[PDB]
């Protein structure tokens, strides 16, 4: 019963914009991968072994009290010099890396805050007093923030129930949102109005991820089923199943091959998009996996965190237990990897966030 519905033409022009922005990026990605994969074998083995040893040699520091209430999300700015943390209070904070010094606390949220995400060009090509950050709350509310205001700017009022996650499209022109209406919306920044209201999930949607080249969008809902929509034409192309409990995390890989999902059944599933088949199932943790994060541009390892008090780093491919990051006295509610890959951040229910680095 794939009952369609005609929407606005703004949606069509935005789809064409996405298509002609994404296609050349995809071709460049394939060309780069083909060029790289044809280098001598010993060099690749040695470099990967050195990377594995460095990952094994990871140490914790700057364990900072982020707030008086549990910390719900942590993100790294482009250039990996600021860390944006959300709290179960109405407060969001920005810290300098790696000294972890508070910069211009943000205010405006009244309920528990969910995810807070920097713009893809926040600290590289955007003036501070423009739109730089986006955040969502436990009640239906989404707010945009700048780096020199401490107060929000033009909000979004298209949601009436809890908003689970917010993500920036790699181009930066569009902002994704997942609501508890069993749907997810796409908000256009230049047009400044919602352009797509996708409903394909049985229950409320929780997590959203965007493909690097801006072609696909992965969505994980509370129904243990995930979708892979094509932003060019909608038309969900891959319905992936195999989890029995809710999916709380989803993340694409720098290469267009793999997707990773975490669910409440304590497992982390690695799917291959070029085979439309689940390729691996990692028994990661002894509790629900909150978030799974592929490594940045290189994409050579996987990072997971669960409601047990540890996170874990696994090889990719191979999915071997490279390292376990312990120390937290509470549930790990979120984690992130610096775009340079030399720093990891993990927030916790213990009101603290820790930074892991190679010694």
């Amino acid at each position: 019963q794939t009952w369609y519905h005609e929407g606005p033409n703004s949606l069509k022009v935005a789809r064409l914009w996405i298509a002609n922005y994404s296609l050349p990026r995809a071709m460049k990605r394939l060309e780069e991968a083909r060029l790289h994969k044809e280098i001598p074998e010993t060099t690749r083995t040695s470099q990967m072994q050195e990377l594995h040893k460095s990952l094994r040699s990871l140490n914790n520091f700057c364990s900072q009290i982020g707030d008086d209430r549990p910390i719900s999300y942590c993100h790294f700015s482009p250039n990996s010099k600021m860390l944006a943390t959300a709290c179960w209070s109405g407060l969001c904070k920005l810290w300098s890396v790696p000294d972890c010094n508070l910069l211009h606390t943000l205010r405006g949220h009244n309920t528990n805050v969910g995810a807070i995400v920097f713009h893809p060009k926040s600290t590289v090509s955007l003036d501070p007093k423009d739109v730089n950050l986006a955040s969502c709350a436990a009640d239906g509310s989404v707010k945009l923030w700048s780096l020199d205001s401490d107060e929000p700017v033009a909000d979004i009022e298209g949601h009436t129930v809890r908003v689970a996650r917010v993500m920036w499209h790699p181009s930066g022109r569009f902002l994704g949102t997942t609501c508890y209406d069993r749907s997810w919306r796409l908000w256009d920044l230049e047009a400044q109005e919602e352009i797509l209201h996708q409903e394909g999930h049985s229950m409320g949607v929780y997590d959203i991820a965007f493909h690097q080249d801006g072609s696909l969008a992965g969505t994980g809902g509370l129904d243990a089923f995930g979708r892979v929509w094509d932003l060019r034409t909608g038309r969900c192309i891959m319905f992936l199943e195999g989890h029995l409990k809710e999916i709380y995390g989803i993340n694409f890989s720098p290469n267009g091959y793999h997707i990773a999902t975490g669910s409440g059944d304590n497992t982390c599933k690695v799917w291959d998009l070029r085979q439309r088949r689940c390729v691996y199932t990692i028994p990661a943790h002894q509790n629900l996996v909150t978030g799974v994060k592929f490594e940045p541009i290189h994409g050579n390892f996987l990072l997971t965190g669960a409601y047990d008090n540890t996170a874990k780093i696994w090889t990719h491919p191979g999915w071997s237990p490279l390292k376990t990051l312990a120390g937290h006295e509470g549930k790990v509610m979120g984690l992130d990897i610096s775009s340079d890959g030399q720093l990891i951040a993990t927030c916790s229910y213990d009101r603290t966030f820790k930074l892991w680095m190679a010694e």
Partner: protein, 332 residues
């Protein structure tokens, strides 16, 4: 088959006042050596108690000739550091480290001397190595955490304490250190939360309850004291905390009674004696002060949080019990 009888006889002779008899017995036992290296330690202690510290140095040389465990190297380094340049003590510590890694007391002493001298980074490295090799040493973790906090960078100290708590885990010392680390900063509610967790996973811990009692507000202390008494009764720390609470409320007779109870329960706690002495001098006649002095001098205590803080600093190491008590009582 064992020198237990010899040790008992030596203690009895020392308790009888006969100096020449005990000294001759110790010298004969050391010469014949029908026991372990304890003969050398007793000789060194007597020489320190003998005419002068020159006798202690002679006994140290005699022990070095007898060559007991590397703890002899620790004693030699300590004697050098007492009055000398850091060169000789550092050389002795390095020789001991080459000889043995654990005992961790060698690393502790090395780091403490390193802080005693110009810079602290080398002390941090020494503590890091000692913890990496021991590795289950609460005092080494405490020394490293205190060093890091004293420099600054409270976040690194918090991370170190978190790692120490993870490694053991579940010992009251690290929990108390973390609570105090959070308290010393402007974070009191975080300290209270850590206190709640520590008491959750270490319910029958006297020191944790003692800290918790005074982490409360004035009107919320009686119930907490009652709970501490119910959970860990006959614990010297809780009795001392109750006596301090009574003293703080001007109920001096009950404070004196509970101080008497605390001393009668555990006489090997330095803090209780100092608190009793200060309470007596602030409240009571002078014969009460002298009586407290005599009771404390009858039984020498140790294992105090701040009593061992003076009985270990190299400045007053060789000072005796009365001056140590006065020093501790004067720091509150």
């Amino acid at each position: 088959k064992a020198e237990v009888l010899w040790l008992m006889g030596a203690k009895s002779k020392w308790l009888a006042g006969d100096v020449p008899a005990a000294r001759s017995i110790l010298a004969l036992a050391f010469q014949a050596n029908p026991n372990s290296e304890e003969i050398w330690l007793a000789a060194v202690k007597l020489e320190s108690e003998n005419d002068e510290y020159e006798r202690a140095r002679r006994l140290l040389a005699k022990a070095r000739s007898s060559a007991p465990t590397a703890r002899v190297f620790m004693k030699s380094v300590k004697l050098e550091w007492v009055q000398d340049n850091i060169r000789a003590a550092q050389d002795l510590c390095e020789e001991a480290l080459r000889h043995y890694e654990d005992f961790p007391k060698l690393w502790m002493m090395k780091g403490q001397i390193e802080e005693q001298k110009e810079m602290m980074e080398k002390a941090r490295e020494a503590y890091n190595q000692g913890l990496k090799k021991c590795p289950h040493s609460t005092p080494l973790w405490l020394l490293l955490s205190r060093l890091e906090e004293k420099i600054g960078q409270l976040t690194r100290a918090r991370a170190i304490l978190e790692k120490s708590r993870l490694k053991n885990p579940k010992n009251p010392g690290l929990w108390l250190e973390s609570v105090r680390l959070e308290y010393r900063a402007g974070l009191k509610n975080i300290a209270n939360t850590l206190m709640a967790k520590a008491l959750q996973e270490c319910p029958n811990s006297g020191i944790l309850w003692s800290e918790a009692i005074f982490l409360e507000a004035r009107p919320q202390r009686r119930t907490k004291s009652v709970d501490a008494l119910k959970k860990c009764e006959h614990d010297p720390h809780v009795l001392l905390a109750v006596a301090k609470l009574f003293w703080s409320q001007r109920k001096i007779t009950k404070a004196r009674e509970w101080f008497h109870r605390t001393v009668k329960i555990d006489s090997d706690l330095g803090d209780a004696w100092a608190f009793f002495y200060k309470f007596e001098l602030q409240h009571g006649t002078e014969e009460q002060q002298e009586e407290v002095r005599k009771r404390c001098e009858s039984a020498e205590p140790r294992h105090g949080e701040l009593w061992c803080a003076v009985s270990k600093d190299i400045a007053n190491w060789q000072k005796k019990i009365g001056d140590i008590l006065r020093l501790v009582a004067g720091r509150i």
